[PDB]
Structure formats: C-alpha cells, structure tokens
C-alpha cells in the first residue's frame, strides 16, 4: 500500500475581474487513498453550495477532484481552499492568488 499527499491548486475559471461573476476552483490531485475533505473559504468561512466532480484518478492511480462554486470577486473578499487528508497532520490551507 502506498499513501500520497494531495496537491492543491486554487484558482478561478476565468481571469478574475471585480464585479464579474466567476467560478472559484480548488483542484486536489495526486492523493491516495480517496477519502478527502475540501472546503472553500470566504474570509475564513466555509462556503455553502460547493459542488465537486466525480472521483477519478490519473495514470499512477492517484485520485483527483475538482471542487467549485460560483463567486463574484471584489477588492474586499479573500478566498482559500482548505483540505484534510489522512496523509496530512491537520488541514492544509491554500489562499487564492489572483495572479495564479
């Protein structure tokens, strides 16, 4: 049995513009086993109405999932993705950066 730590990318579906509706993505990949908890945070608070893709996996058999929700960026709100997995001691949090 091998266990693998999730990689995490946080990003928007489209180039972000204040006032323009968009999708906030948290892509988790490269992890094993498959149980995993992923939250999207708006100013440190779990967003509701976050949906995710169906469990799939890559050529090395490690899993990936896309979590996403609708959002409209603005110059005040801060977003992050927070992940819990058996390979991680405590949650790993990645902030949304508009330039990545």
């Amino acid at each position: 049995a091998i266990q693998r730590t999730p990689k995490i990318q946080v990003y928007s579906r489209h180039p972000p513009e204040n006032g323009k509706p968009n999708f906030l993505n948290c892509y988790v990949s490269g992890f094993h086993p498959s149980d995993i908890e992923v939250d999207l945070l708006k100013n440190g608070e779990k967003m509701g109405k976050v949906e995710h893709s169906d469990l799939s996996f890559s050529k090395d058999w490690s899993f990936y999932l896309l979590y996403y929700t609708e959002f409209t960026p603005n110059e005040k709100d801060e977003y992050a993705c927070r992940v819990n997995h058996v390979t991680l001691s405590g949650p790993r949090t990645v902030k949304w950066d508009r330039d990545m």
């Binding site: 579906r13 086993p33 149980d35 169906d54 899993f63």
Partner: protein
C-alpha cells in the same frame, strides 16, 4: 493521435460500516460522459455529458445493470485480495481498475487496456498484445493463472475489438461538435515584479481541449530549466483546461524571453512575449 473510450472504477471497502463505496466513470478522450455512484438510494448509471442524454431507456437500464454486476464482482475481488495478502478483516482497502479501447485512424482497434491496482499499487494488467497478462506479485499471479484458465483475455479482447469501438464511434458522432473540436488555448503573458531588479513572467494557456499541451520558456532561443515553475494541467470546470509557466528574469531583459506553446488546436506552434 487517436480517440479513446475508457471506463474507470474505484471500490473502497468500508469494514463494519456496511458495503463498499463503488464510484465508476466513463470518458471519451478527456471528456467524462457517465457516472455510477453506489452511495445513492437506488443508484443508477447517469449522464454527465449532454450528447449521451439522447440515449434511450434501454441504454440506461443495461448500463446500470452492468455497473451493479461490476460492483458485485469488485466486492468479491476486495475480499479475495484481502485474503491473498493475509490482511486484517479490519481496515479499508481500495481496488481500482480501468479498461477501454483506442480507435485507430484505420477504423479498427489501435490499442486496448485492462489494468488494475490494489491500495494504490499496480496489481495486474492486460499485455499490449491483448493475449497475455503481466502480474505485479505472487498474489497477482494467482489471478493470472485463473484468468488464463477461463481465457478471460480472449473474451475481453473481443469486447475491445467489437462493441468498444462500436460505441466509441457512436459517441464520437453524437458529440462531434465538442468531442471533435480542438479548442485552442487562449494565451497571454503577465508581468509581476519580484524585486528592484527581477520580475516574474507568467505565460498562460486557458480554455484548451484536449488536455495535452506543451508550454516552455526560452531565453535567447534556449530552453529554460532554472528559476521556473510550471503548474500541472488543471480543469477549468467547463470541460476545458488551463496551464501556466512562470520564469524569473532580470528587470529589463524581458524581451529576451519567449513562451512556446504547442496544442492540437494551434495550426502552428505559438511564440509569445510580454507585451507592455
């Protein structure tokens, strides 16, 4: 260049907490088009792409029956594998499989697949000649001898050579307006100062389909391998993909740097520069 039909399956034992979780997905190329999730009340094979929704009621009942048969087989295999490895009855384990066919531009079978993994490690795979198995360990050799006894490789090869390609051709026709459209990446270069004398050039490729893409930075025509970061190709959520590559450069030497981007949707390979 070839189209592909592939099904993927994950089965996770839930010791004590009832039956295992089975999650099955099917893809044409990089486009998922069906799912089956055992953790529903009366779970069914379900559409996940518009162009499969036209499939009749017989289709969905037979694919749902097929998923339930696989689930039963997967649960048996989880038990068997637990035995082969003399593992505890407590403790969740994971079985994964994939299988499918590549359509050759000839119209026949170009390549076929039937592979499996247990707890994240290769277990047994159908060889590329579609006639023999490769086993990872002595437990998998036990599976191999038994599947040789029932001539499973020949029977599965018949599926790959016939119906697998038949259904793939069908799907390719019904979803041709998206499945057979190479979406080219929309590309640009952004500039982010790092210090009084260095800055980051980030080269973006957005909204491309299929996923496969090459994206490199060059300085004076030579390919850059230091002071870079390329992110793994990632889904946009709308069926297309994104990728970027960033390189740290001396302030004032930006124009010596070119981003090179190749994609099926690009008639010619793309060369890009920061354009203040």
């Amino acid at each position: 260049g070839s189209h592909s039909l592939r099904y993927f399956g994950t089965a996770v034992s839930r010791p004590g907490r009832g039956e295992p979780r089975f999650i099955y997905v099917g893809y044409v190329d990089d486009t998922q088009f069906v799912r089956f999730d055992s953790d529903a009340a009366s779970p069914r094979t379900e559409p996940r792409a518009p162009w499969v929704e036209q499939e009749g009621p017989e289709y969905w009942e037979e694919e749902t029956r097929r998923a339930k048969a696989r689930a039963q087989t997967d649960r048996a295999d989880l038990r068997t594998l637990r035995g082969y490895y003399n593992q505890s009855e407590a403790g969740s384990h994971t079985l994964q499989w994939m299988a499918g066919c590549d359509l050759g531009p000839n119209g026949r079978l170009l390549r076929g697949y039937h592979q499996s993994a247990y707890d994240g490690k290769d277990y047994i795979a159908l060889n590329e000649d579609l006639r023999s198995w490769i086993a990872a360990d002595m437990a998998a050799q036990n599976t191999q001898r038994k599947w040789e006894a029932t001539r499973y490789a020949e029977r599965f090869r018949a599926y790959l050579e016939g119906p697998c390609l038949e259904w793939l051709r069908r799907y390719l026709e019904n979803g041709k307006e998206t499945l057979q459209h190479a979406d080219p990446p929309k590309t640009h270069v952004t500039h982010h100062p790092v210090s009084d004398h260095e800055a980051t050039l980030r080269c973006w490729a957005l909204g491309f389909y299929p996923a496969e893409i090459t994206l490199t930075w060059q300085r004076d025509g030579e390919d850059q391998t230091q002071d870079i970061e390329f992110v793994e190709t990632r889904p946009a959520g709308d069926g297309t993909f994104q990728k970027w590559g960033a390189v740290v450069v001396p302030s004032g030497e930006e124009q010596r740097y070119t981003c090179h981007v190749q994609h099926k949707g690009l008639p010619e390979p793309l060369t890009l520069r920061w354009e203040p």
